[model samples]
Target: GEIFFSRGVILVEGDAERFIVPAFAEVLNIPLDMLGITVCSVGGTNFTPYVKLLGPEGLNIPHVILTDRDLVRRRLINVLDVIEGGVDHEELDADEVIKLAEQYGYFVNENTLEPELFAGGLAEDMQEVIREELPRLRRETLNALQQWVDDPAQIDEDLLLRLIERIGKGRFAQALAPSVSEDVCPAYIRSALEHIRDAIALEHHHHH
Candidate 1:
């Protein structure tokens, strides 16, 4: 039996402007009372927020889990050095760090870079696509949710909740699905689904 390891990068766009509101809402387990205040003074070229992944209790998942090992610390150092270099720390962002990681072969691509996989122009292309489109896609996805909320008739709540669940589960699947080889699904998958359920449950309890 072979054990496979999977990794992922949760690319956030525009200083994570799109995710901050929803993520904070999820973390606080409350509907945003003031979206404006929540996102105020956090825009443009002067704000490069470090991306964070929060679990049930604000658990800080290690960057190495999703990052390339060789370049992970180097990327951090580069960011620190850039800040020390006085390049408008806010303008410094994760995209560059990701690129540096890739350059150092610390990060592996799930789509094509298997354990035996070799680097080529194709990997570069994949990296570009991942870097360029992922954030946009995330923003689009989040924006779609907001739009749906603004016009509920456009999307049924039941369906929307299911869709969110699917997306959440799909993300876990993308990282873990390739690794499993058994008659049963992983308990972690079930746990992730439960988290989604909890999120929706909180949303309903708080807002409805």
Candidate 2:
């Protein structure tokens, strides 16, 4: 696998993220392939094994992870299981937990990828593409999303998640990819890419 020789690995969860990461890389113009970076999707959020596989304990490949906010607590704990062997995370609050994880190349989104995009100012772009791709989407749902775009406080995350599932996250993202711009890229994603870039740059520097 390319990951074996990659200077860095961008490990993400699931299909949508698999597609979204490189698309965002294109938006950021980070030149992932040229940098010897491989974007690998775990197919789900159980990143423990892959984290262990690539973390310092295993192949020792420098890697970065993007995960949903809700699962940050448990996920970070799991990540520590390999990186630190174990830790008492129960005493830490959410923000504290997040800060600790960030130090280890783990970036947690504001929410799951779908809701994160909606809140990240891509509501209009996502709505248009999702509607065009799934023409049979419920008008009521479309209207609700439109209203939410006008006032984000009205957003129903469950509804947004459902729509993405119906269209299939991978398909939903592929349809929305062309419309993605740097302005709408999520902060965590941007940072994760930036982290890998700096990590690889440092790695490259040491080679000389």
The TM-score of candidate 2 is 0.89
Clashes of each: 1, 0
Candidate 2, run of 10 with poorest lDDT: 80-89
Candidate 2 Cα RMSD after full superposition onto the native fold (Å): 2.1
- Give the TM-score of each candidate: 0.19, 0.89
Q: For residue 55, what is the lDDT in candidate 1?
A: 19
lDDT of 2 by residue, 32-69 (tens): 99999999998878889988889877898889999887
Off-target runs (Cα >4 Å) in candidate 1 are: 1-21, 29-70, 86-208
lDDT of 1 by residue, 24-109 (tens): 33444333332111222223222113222221122322111122232244444443343334333334355555444432222322
Full-model lDDT for every candidate: 0.31, 0.84
lDDT of 2 at 37: 93
